[PDB]
Amino acid sequence: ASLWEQFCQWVTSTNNRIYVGWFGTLMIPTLLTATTCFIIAFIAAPPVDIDGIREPVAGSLLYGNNIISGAVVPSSNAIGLHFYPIWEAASLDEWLYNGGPYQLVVFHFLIGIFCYMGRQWELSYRLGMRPWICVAYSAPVSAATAVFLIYPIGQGSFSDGMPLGISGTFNFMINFQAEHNILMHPFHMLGVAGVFGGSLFSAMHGSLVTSSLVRETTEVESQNYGYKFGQEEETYNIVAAHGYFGRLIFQYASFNNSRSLHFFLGAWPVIGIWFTAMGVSTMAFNLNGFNFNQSILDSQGRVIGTWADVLNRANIGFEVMHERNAHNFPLDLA
Amino acid sequence: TYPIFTVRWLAVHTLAVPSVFFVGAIAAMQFIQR
Amino acid sequence: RGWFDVLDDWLKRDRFVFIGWSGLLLFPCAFMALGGWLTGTTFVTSWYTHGLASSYLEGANFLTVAVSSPADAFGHSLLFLWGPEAQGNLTRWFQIGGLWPFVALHGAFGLIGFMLRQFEISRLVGIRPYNAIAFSGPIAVFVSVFLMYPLGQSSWFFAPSFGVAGIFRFILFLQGFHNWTLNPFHMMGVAGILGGALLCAIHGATVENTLFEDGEDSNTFRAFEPTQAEETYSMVTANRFWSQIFGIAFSNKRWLHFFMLFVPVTGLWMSSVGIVGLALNLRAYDFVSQELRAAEDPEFETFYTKNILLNEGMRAWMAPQDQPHENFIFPEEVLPRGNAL
Amino acid sequence: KLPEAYQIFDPLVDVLPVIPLFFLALAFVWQAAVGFK
Amino acid sequence: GGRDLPSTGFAWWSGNARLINLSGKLLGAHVAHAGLIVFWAGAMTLFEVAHFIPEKPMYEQGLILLPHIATLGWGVGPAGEVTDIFPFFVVGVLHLISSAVLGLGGIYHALRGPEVLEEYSSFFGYDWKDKNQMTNIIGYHLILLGCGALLLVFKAMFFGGVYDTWAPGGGDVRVITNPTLNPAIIFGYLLKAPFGGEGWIISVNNMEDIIGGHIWIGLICISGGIWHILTKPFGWARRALIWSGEAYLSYSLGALSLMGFIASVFVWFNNTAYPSEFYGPTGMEASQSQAFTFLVRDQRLGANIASAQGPTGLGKYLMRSPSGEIIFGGETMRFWDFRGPWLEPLRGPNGLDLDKLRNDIQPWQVRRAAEYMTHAPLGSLNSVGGVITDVNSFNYVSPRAWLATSHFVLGFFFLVGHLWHAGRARAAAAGFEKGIDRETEPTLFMPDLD
Amino acid sequence: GRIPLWVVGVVAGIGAIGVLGLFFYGAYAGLGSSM
Amino acid sequence: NLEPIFQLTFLGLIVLAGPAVVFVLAFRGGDL
Amino acid sequence: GTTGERPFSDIVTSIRYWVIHSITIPMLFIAGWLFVSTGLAYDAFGTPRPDEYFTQTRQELPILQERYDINQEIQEFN
Amino acid sequence: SIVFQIALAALVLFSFVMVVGVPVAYASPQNWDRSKPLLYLGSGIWAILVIVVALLNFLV
Ligand code: CLA
Ligand code: CLA
Ligand code: CLA
Ligand code: CLA
Ligand code: CLA
Ligand SMILES: CCCCCCCCCCCCCCCCCC(=O)OC[C@H](CO[C@@H]1O[C@H](CO)[C@H](O)[C@H](O)[C@H]1O)OC(=O)CCCCCCCCCCCCCCCCC
Ligand SMILES: CC1=C(/C=C/C(C)=C/C=C/C(C)=C/C=C/C=C(C)/C=C/C=C(C)/C=C/C2=C(C)CCCC2(C)C)C(C)(C)CCC1
Ligand SMILES: CC1=C(/C=C/C(C)=C/C=C/C(C)=C/C=C/C=C(C)/C=C/C=C(C)/C=C/C2=C(C)CCCC2(C)C)C(C)(C)CCC1
Ligand SMILES: CC1=C(/C=C/C(C)=C/C=C/C(C)=C/C=C/C=C(C)/C=C/C=C(C)/C=C/C2=C(C)CCCC2(C)C)C(C)(C)CCC1
Ligand code: OEX
Ligand SMILES: [Ca+2]
Ligand SMILES: [Cl-]
Ligand SMILES: [Cl-]
Ligand SMILES: [Fe+2]
């Protein structure tokens, strides 16, 4: 009945079109700030000296970039890991030249997505649901944290963070392959298993449900109209799906329990993305993928190349050309 | 009184026999010195 | 009782491993593909085709073994065992990469057999054949990547090799020579595969966390009967949760499960279209506007131009070893490289 | 290296750190002995 | 105590949840696990000793436990060279023997002793909902934890000291005589920004500050333990918190995740509590060592390292940080906040000093920079050291890399565990952890969103 | 006269970890070890 | 070396021990 | 639920199965071991032994160049 | 010095016999009367063996 109590009831209200919640009271300002600065920067930001060698990179549409090539450029290598808000620049133009929009957008984004995870738990609690949708959402959160926060921290610079753009993302991946051999890292391999399997199982489950729908419609209408939102009854026959799938492979390779099946569907890609996030997070500390260069020698001691050696040649090609003006010393130590 | 030899038996052996053969061969290779 | 009907009876028996008419082409073909791959990765070299060790016997590990593609010199020859190259000599057939077309062609016919098995079992059980239709994505990828890409290229040599690191080489080769990440068709494929993973994770999690209290135990898995008529989770609660979290939510379960098939399958088809383009070197390699500008304006740099430079480096440093038949002699002084590094 | 009076049990020392992994596996072995009840 | 699904509702893969309200068996599980921890400490230490080459540097031999002992000042002398292996061996053996005592006690309590301690004792019997007793347990443990911190203090002050990499005349074990008691410095450390140039508590750079911190920590922990034994949770905390065993587990999981991330950063960045003579260079140190190594070479070849502009226009060997400090050039410009005992002699008030860089270099500094640069914490998963494109002949992965990567992963998965148990504790307290009741589904009584 | 299935599972698991550990030993010895 | 033999012998002893304890406890109707 | 065949758990827990497989699985394992250790596999698949990648007359890769006559090239490569 | 290795070997073998015996004794409720004093004997003998090894290390 107090005004604070009234505000609390409104914030935690389950009748708002968009749930706010306490986590939302943080999510909304941070994500809105990040979105505004990101759109403005992507459209209009001046070039950014990412590599700190006074060689500004054009990232914005108005400076000659298309949607594919445009990006918000990570902050200058001269900044390193230093905190660089607007009020630490002698002018907004100095802030822009050194890639301040990247720091603002990433920090607000990171806070916003952690709050989004908390908000998912919060609404599940208010709806009397089970609480673990946020656990599944923690996989993409972990991956985003790896590329925007953990990798820069381990490498020592926000200039090494993933650029906020499409071609910027490819640059990040290529450089990452050149310096870490992520393809030959087992955690990336589990991430690929996670995403290939997640798509495989999405296709499998979708196709098996769609194949086993109960006849409810006529041939002139979409079969989707055979389901009514809120209906008691199941819209497909899991028994028929299991008969088909257990004959496609063998009876014991097929689920007869929807709860067990939906758990597997949730767990597989989530676990795979946790592994890949941890892989990126550990190569942040330069614990790289497998090195098998010159592993096979003949009796005289001559190197017999393998596919890993050819991959290494590709990596060396990427490495010698990257940041072509940024290195003064022979070893790329970060 | 189940049958001994069926289609499942052959499906199991067609894979299991060469698999154990190959596993032994790959075990032998672990001791090849250059 | 005619012999055809008696055969169709035995082939369609309910046994541990269903066979069916499709099995006559799925099982021998899949077994040839799998056994050829295991055989090649265990025993067979790529010394005469690639100048590489590619089997466990030579010392490679699971990550580095491969059934490597045949030598460039054979072009697109099907390299039959009895063909004019091997001439029935099994050892020579192994040494010239004959196992690569063996695995690829038996695998293609095995994939045809698996799709026919999907259709056959769907018809026997009485369901719609959407699992078979979903599998067209994987076949589109196999055909475009392992057959049409090398068929458009100079030879089977440039087809991906059947191996972990062989596939990684193929991936990096497509980056450095084709700028395949810039290709919109690949981008649609990435969106499809990542969205498929997302849909899998979010459906699984949503269903598990909107479950109805159907049992007394903490182990909620025991609270489901396969024959029960009632939905095991609340679609209304799920819908409200996602409507208030994400702004929108599924409200039709049939559309939800169709979407879970549509997204990854469509992504595989689109990526396959892009690969077909790459078979002819029809690549989204460059943005000519930005190349013209950087040519005229030396202050102008984007992430796109940087990736172009990365590709030139990869090509120059990888070509001599990756294409040993071309006798690429690139002296050290012509190799592109930035400062110091 | 271990002190000279202990260089005898050196092969035993090399196989000691792994044992907790065997504890984790032994949990599963006991569950399988009780039938995963 | 039920040991099956029909009697507990928990499957075999959730079997340890069957111990939630079995305080005796739970205590047994805990003591046997502690036994596992102490067993690993002792056995892994003995493994490291048996595999230790005394003359070869510790970070070249895959050691992570002997560096911890050596930082405490046992078995090592100046510059971290090993004086005697016996203290490492003694530490290992004492942990290994105690492990058996804890294993016995655990197997006893887990298997033979009372399953519930409530009946037996009022002192050891606890109910999760009994806030006074749970705070008693918090207090007894806070007093032992503070006692352990004071044990570190006593070792550093009265029992031979600890390794001070910053000691004058070279790194060595030092007895700390003036630990920093000034609460402004000590707690100021807590208030420093966790960004470059400040580093929050990771930037603690002298043993006097570390030791003064542990006197404060011991004092605050002992005081908090006494407070928790003599008090009960207040109303606001009784209202904002979930009071259950799973809830307390989730709280400790959140704390553990935080500490794991902190430890990862600590080992990656700090070279005071983690001396480079045991742990190898930090990656910041290796980069700065590269810049320094080629500063010395080129200067000795006659280059003007001050006035030599690089191809970009910035100084090749020396430049200015964005705040003007004279720093090493090249990509290492990012690590210009790095402080190291071999570098700091060449730094003036304005940063790197030209007079010092031209006249006061020492061969030990050049040797140290060469060693640190060639031991950059870069390596492959199969321990092929150096950059990932290098060939297979260098067997090295930095201990800093191993420790940082391991504790980041453990911190993350423990954050996930916190979320798992915190959400489950909340749902179970509220009564819908087992699913939605069909009759009273809340959404069926809520208005449509539109 | 039936061997308990958990014993069969334990024996097969021991043998499988053994073959895997022999394969990992070979990574550091003989061919393909870089030495 | 006889060392690879001693290491594998100790490891085999340790590997058998735990399963042996479970086997004895199951054969003798212990509190498994 | 059962398609007619004996359950695997009933098969592998039986005395006769293991009486047979205590010999069959080891015999296959040793057959593969011998296939490798006698040098038979090198001859069968034409995989070079560790001292046959390079010969006295050839220090470079034996990359195939003929379209058809590969018995001859592989012989000259030795 | 060989007496030291004898004592240490005895410690390692008694340790194995106790690793076998402790969980069986604590999980065999019907044999508990016979196995409690044996448990006490094993614990005391193990501690004495540890002390003997300790001292001998300090005598050799
Ligand atoms: C740190 C690891 C750890 C620890 C300490 C425990 C401890 C415990 N578990 Mg858990 N558990 C674990 C891991 C662990 N578990 C894992 C990984 C799983 C998944 C497989 C389970 C699954 C599980 C289930 C399903 C159940 C338990 C139960 C229990 C409790 C009763 C144990 C019992 O009666 O077993 C009896 C087992 C035996 C008698 C077999 C022998 C065990 C002994 C301890 C072997 C010790 C050998 C050792 C080398 C001897 C050294 C002696 C000397 C040197 C000191 C006990 C407190 C039960 C419970 O909750 O009770 C209510 C229960 O139902 N656990
Ligand atoms: C904090 C933990 C930690 C850390 C940092 C290290 C670090 C190190 N150890 Mg040690 N070790 C540990 C724990 C640790 N160890 C434990 C618990 C054991 C008992 C088995 C050992 C036993 C041991 C031996 C016997 C040896 C080492 C060695 C080494 C060195 C080389 C490591 C190597 O090549 O790994 C290879 C890397 C791997 C095998 C990768 C492991 C991947 C893990 C399993 C992924 C799991 C992640 C995640 C939690 C999964 C959860 C899934 C789920 C939650 C979703 C290195 C210094 C070697 C050395 O040099 O000694 C001098 C050596 O010979 N260690
Ligand atoms: C966290 C550890 C812990 C805890 C809380 C308990 C608690 C308990 N045990 Mg258990 N126990 C433990 C560890 C633990 N034990 C270990 C490791 C062993 C193996 C030696 C045992 C062996 C054991 C047996 C055999 C029995 C108990 C019994 C008991 C109960 C009465 C204890 C008693 O006599 O009163 C208080 C006892 C004292 C005040 C004197 C003992 C205090 C210790 C020995 C000295 C200080 C500990 C240590 C050396 C110093 C710090 C430790 C270091 C790691 C920092 C009580 C529930 C008895 C029981 O179940 O009764 C029904 C019983 O029969 N325990
Ligand atoms: C492991 C140690 C431990 C544990 C588990 C507890 C547990 C508890 N303490 Mg105790 N306490 C401890 C140590 C500990 N204390 C010590 C060492 C002292 C001495 C200083 C005290 C002094 C103390 C007092 C004086 C009081 C408690 C109280 C409480 C209760 C509620 C506290 C609360 O809501 O915290 C959560 C904290 C808050 C709600 C405060 C909000 C702080 C905001 C969110 C900022 C948080 C910082 C940020 C999120 C983290 C940054 C990371 C970095 C700083 C590490 C709870 C039972 C209260 C109680 O009921 O007394 C009986 C109380 O009044 N404690
Ligand atoms: C000290 C920390 C701690 C403690 C005491 C517990 C305790 C508990 N948890 Mg939690 N949990 C934790 C941390 C912790 N957890 C963390 C960090 C995570 C995140 C990964 C989780 C995630 C989690 C889930 C998802 C669930 C629990 C559950 C439970 C309960 C039953 C657990 C059980 O029987 O496991 C049995 C043990 C096993 C089945 C063995 C797990 C084997 C894993 C995969 C191996 C991990 C890798 C390991 C390092 C080996 C790598 C080497 C490899 C090469 C072989 C119990 C109360 C359950 C629950 O809610 O019950 C109420 C449950 O469903 N926990
Ligand atoms: C529970 C199942 C049972 C587990 C127990 C057995 C399983 C596998 C163990 C066999 C491993 C062989 C041991 C090495 C032989 C001794 C030679 C030696 O000293 O080292 C030989 C070499 C060289 O090392 C040096 O060799 C010298 C000459 O022989 C001397 O022996 C030196 O002392 C030695 O250090 O080192 C290695 O290769 C060590 C790395 C590999 C050893 C362990 C491999 C991993 C073990 C299993 C893990 C993978 C399995 C996955 C399963 C999934 C579930 C976890
Ligand atoms: C080619 C050819 C052919 C054919 C042949 C064949 C058909 C073969 C087969 C073969 C086979 C069919 C083989 C197999 C094998 C297999 C293997 C090689 C195995 C392996 C395994 C492993 C190694 C695994 C492991 C593991 C894991 C990972 C998991 C779990 C655990 C374990 C340990 C189990 C012909 C004559 C027509 C002609 C000529 C050519
Ligand atoms: C030793 C040392 C030192 C020291 C340190 C110190 C002094 C410490 C302290 C520390 C501290 C001082 C700690 C703290 C912490 C904190 C925290 C961690 C908190 C948390 C909280 C919470 C968790 C809350 C929650 C909540 C909220 C948010 C609101 C409402 C609801 C709830 C209640 C749930 C130095 C650095 C000098 C040096 C080195 C060494
Ligand atoms: C320090 C020391 C010691 C101690 C030791 C110990 C403490 C022991 C332990 C022991 C142990 C702790 C062992 C155990 C083990 C375990 C195992 C070996 C297991 C295995 C596993 C498996 C094989 C699995 C399988 C399975 C199952 C059962 C479930 C389901 C699935 C499957 C079927 C896969 C001694 C006395 C030597 C003396 C010297 C010093
Ligand atoms: O910033 Mn972005 O990419 Ca990370 O490694 Mn060093 O730094 Mn630069 O060179 Mn390579
Ligand atoms: Ca040894
Ligand atoms: Cl670049
Ligand atoms: Cl540089
Ligand atoms: Fe579904």
Closest CA to A323 of C340, E285, E135, B31: C340
Pairwise CA distance, residues C236 & C232, whole Å: 12
How close, in Å, is residue F14 to chain C by CA atoms? 21
Q: Contact C137/C144 with Cβ under 8 angstroms?
A: no
Compute φ and ψ for A80, nearest 5 degrees: 65, -125
Distance of CA E304 from the midpoint of ligand 1 (Å): 69
Place of tokens 């930035």: C338
Name the binding residues of A for Fe cation: 205, 262
Residue A92 in tokens: 């907004």
Quickly count: other Cβ atoms within 10 Å of residue E277's Cβ: 26
How close, in Å, is residue E436 to chain A by CA atoms? 7
Q: In angstroms, what CA-CA distances link C22 with C12, C29, C160?
A: 10, 11, 28
Distance of CA A139 from the midpoint of ligand 14 (Å): 20
Q: Contact C266/C192 with Cβ under 8 angstroms?
A: yes
Is the Cβ atom of F22 under 6 angstroms away from ligand 7?
Answer: no
Is the Cβ atom of E414 under 6 angstroms away from ligand 5?
Answer: yes
Pairwise CA distance, residues A23 & E419, whole Å: 14
Please list the residues that pair with A57 across neighbouring strands.
A48
Pairwise CA distance, residues A185 & A182, whole Å: 5
Tell me whether A303 touches chain F (CB under 8 Å): no
Q: Whose CA is nearest to atom 11 of ligand 3?
A: E105
Q: In angstroms, what CA-CA distances link E166 with A126, E78, E159, E206, E275?
A: 55, 11, 20, 7, 9
Q: Whose CA is nearest to atom 22 of ligand 1?
A: E15
Is the Cβ atom of A238 under 6 angstroms away from ligand 2?
Answer: no
Q: Contact A184/A312 with Cβ under 8 angstroms?
A: no
Q: In angstroms, what CA-CA distances link E202 with A24, E28, E188, E269, E327?
A: 31, 37, 12, 7, 21
Pairwise CA distance, residues A65 & C148, whole Å: 34
Pairwise CA distance, residues A156 & E332, whole Å: 9
Q: In angstroms, what CA-CA distances link E424 with E130, E249, E308, E433, G5?
A: 20, 11, 63, 6, 50
- Which of F31, F33, F34 should one mutate to test binding to chain C, selecting the residue with the greatest count of C CBs within 10 A? F31
Distance of CA C37 from the midpoint of ligand 7 (Å): 8
- Please choose from E128, E129, E228, E266 the residue to mutate so as to test ligand 4's pocket, defined by most ligand atoms within 8 A of CB: E228
Closest CA to E450 of C243, I11, C96, C80: C243
Give buried/exposed letters for A48-82 (b at 16+ CB in 10 A, else e).
bbbbbbebbbbbbeebbbeebbbbbbbbbbbbbbb
* Residue C186 marked ligand-binding: yes
Residue H73 in tokens: 């090239």
Give buried/exposed letters for E345-372 (b at 16+ CB in 10 A, else e).
ebbeeebbbeeebeeebeeebbebbbbb
Pairwise CA distance, residues E47 & D15, whole Å: 8
Pairwise CA distance, residues C55 & C58, whole Å: 6
Pairwise CA distance, residues A253 & A204, whole Å: 13
Rg, C-alpha atoms of chain B: 15
Overall size of chain E counted in residues: 450
Is the Cβ atom of E2 under 6 angstroms away from ligand 5?
Answer: no
Rg, C-alpha atoms of chain C: 26
Q: Contact C61/C152 with Cβ under 8 angstroms?
A: no
Q: Is A156 exposed, middle or buried (0-12, 13-18, 19+ CB in 10 A)?
A: buried
Q: In angstroms, what CA-CA distances link C128 with A208, A228, A241, C138, C272?
A: 9, 21, 10, 19, 25
Closest CA to A84 of C157, E195, H50: E195
Q: Whose CA is nearest to atom 51 of ligand 2?
A: E413
Q: Which of I26, I43, I46 sits opposite E107 (nearest CB)?
A: I26
Q: Contact E219/E104 with Cβ under 8 angstroms?
A: no
How close, in Å, is residue A236 to chain H by CA atoms? 21
Closest CA to A210 of C17, I8, C132: C132
* Full DSSP string of C195-221: HHHHHHHHHHHHHHHSBB--SSSS-GG
Q: Contact E179/E208 with Cβ under 8 angstroms?
A: yes
Residue C90 in tokens: 């099994």
Tell me whether A296 touches chain F (CB under 8 Å): yes
How close, in Å, is residue A269 to chain C by CA atoms? 6
DSSP label of A236: B
Backbone region of residue E76 per phi and psi (left: phi > 0; alpha: psi in -120 to 50; beta: other values): beta
**Is the sign of the CA dihedral E218, E220, E223, E229 positive or negative?**
negative
Determine the atom of ligand 3 nearest the C-alpha atom of E104: 19
Q: Contact A205/C256 with Cβ under 8 angstroms?
A: no
Compute φ and ψ for E309, nearest 5 degrees: -80, 140
Tell me whether C84 touches chain H (CB under 8 Å): yes
Tell me whether A252 touches chain H (CB under 8 Å): no
Q: In angstroms, what CA-CA distances link E179 with A166, D2, E150, E186, E187?
A: 53, 36, 12, 10, 14
Q: Which of D14, D23, D29 sits opposite G7 (nearest CB)?
A: D14
Closest CA to E369 of E273, E282, E288, E279: E288
Q: Contact A50/A57 with Cβ under 8 angstroms?
A: yes
Which residues in E lie closer than 8 A to residue C219 (C-beta atoms)?
5, 9-11, 14
Determine the atom of ligand 9 nearest the C-alpha atom of F11: 23
Please list the residues that pair with C67 across neighbouring strands.
C162
Residue C55 in tokens: 């089997």
Distance of CA B22 from the midpoint of ligand 7 (Å): 6
Please list the residues that pair with A297 across neighbouring strands.
A303
Q: Contact A20/A8 with Cβ under 8 angstroms?
A: no
Tell me whether A252 touches chain B (CB under 8 Å): no
* Residue B8 marked ligand-binding: yes
Q: Which one of the ligands is nearest to C235 CA? A: 14
Distance of CA E266 from the midpoint of ligand 11 (Å): 32
Pairwise CA distance, residues E251 & A58, whole Å: 46
Pairwise CA distance, residues D13 & C73, whole Å: 57
Distance of CA G20 from the midpoint of ligand 9 (Å): 9
Residue A139 in tokens: 């996989």
Q: Do chains G and D touch (3 or more CB pairs under 8 A)?
A: yes
Number of H helices, E strands in chain B: 1, 0
Overall size of chain F counted in residues: 35
Tell me whether I2 touches chain E (CB under 8 Å): no
Report the number of distinct structural domains present in chain I: 1
Q: In angstroms, what CA-CA distances link A243 with A249, A256, C119, H5?
A: 10, 9, 14, 17
DSSP label of B5: S
Pairwise CA distance, residues C65 & C161, whole Å: 10
Q: Which one of the ligands is nearest to A130 CA? A: 5
How close, in Å, is residue A220 to chain E by CA atoms? 30
Quickly count: other Cβ atoms within 10 Å of residue C185's Cβ: 20
Pairwise CA distance, residues A5 & A9, whole Å: 6
Please list the residues that pair with E352 across neighbouring strands.
E347
Q: Which residues contact G4 (CB under 8 A, 6 or more apart)?
A: none
Tell me how far the alpha carbon of residue A101 is from its chain's centroid: 20
Q: Do chains D and C touch (3 or more CB pairs under 8 A)?
A: no
Place of tokens 């000279």: D4
Helix (H, G, I), strand (E, B) or coil at B30: coil
- For every residue of chain E, which 3-state class applies, written as one string? CCCCHHHHCCCHHHHHHHHCCCHHHHHHHHHHHHHHHHHHHHHHHHHHHHCCCCCCCHHHCCCCCHHHHHHCCCCECHHHCECCCHHHHHHHHHHHHHHHHHHHHHHHHHHHCCCCHHHHCCCCCCCCCCHHHHHHHHHHHHHHHHHHHHHHHHHHHHCCCEEECCCCCCCEEECCCCCCCCHHHHHHHHCCCCCCCCCHHHHCCCHHHHHHHHHHHHHHHHHHHHHHHHCCCCHHHHHHCCCCHHHHHHHHHHHHHHHHHHHHHHHHHCCCCCCHHHHCCCHHHHHHHHHHHHHHHHHHCCCCCCCCECCCCCECCEEECCCCCEEECCHHHHHCCCCCCCCHHHEECCEECHHHHHHCCCHHHHHHHHHHHHCCCCEECCCCECCCCCCCCCCCCCHHHHHHHHHHHHHHHHHHHHHHHHHHHHHHHHCCCCCECCCCCHHHHCCCCC
Tell me whether F23 touches chain B (CB under 8 Å): yes
Is the Cβ atom of E406 under 6 angstroms away from ligand 2?
Answer: yes
Contact between E435 and C218 using a beta-carbon 8 Å cutoff: no
Chains touching F, CB cut-off 8 Å, 3+ pairs: A, B, C, D, E, G, H
Compute φ and ψ for H49, nearest 5 degrees: -75, 165
Q: List the CATH code of the domain at H8-77.
A: 1.20.5.860
**Is the sign of the CA dihedral G2, G4, G7, G10 positive or negative?**
negative
Helix (H, G, I), strand (E, B) or coil at C162: strand
Quickly count: other Cβ atoms within 10 Å of residue E29's Cβ: 16
Q: In angstroms, what CA-CA distances link C272 with A183, C157, C167, C317?
A: 22, 20, 16, 28
Q: Which of C221, C222, C240 sits opposite E449 (nearest CB)?
A: C240
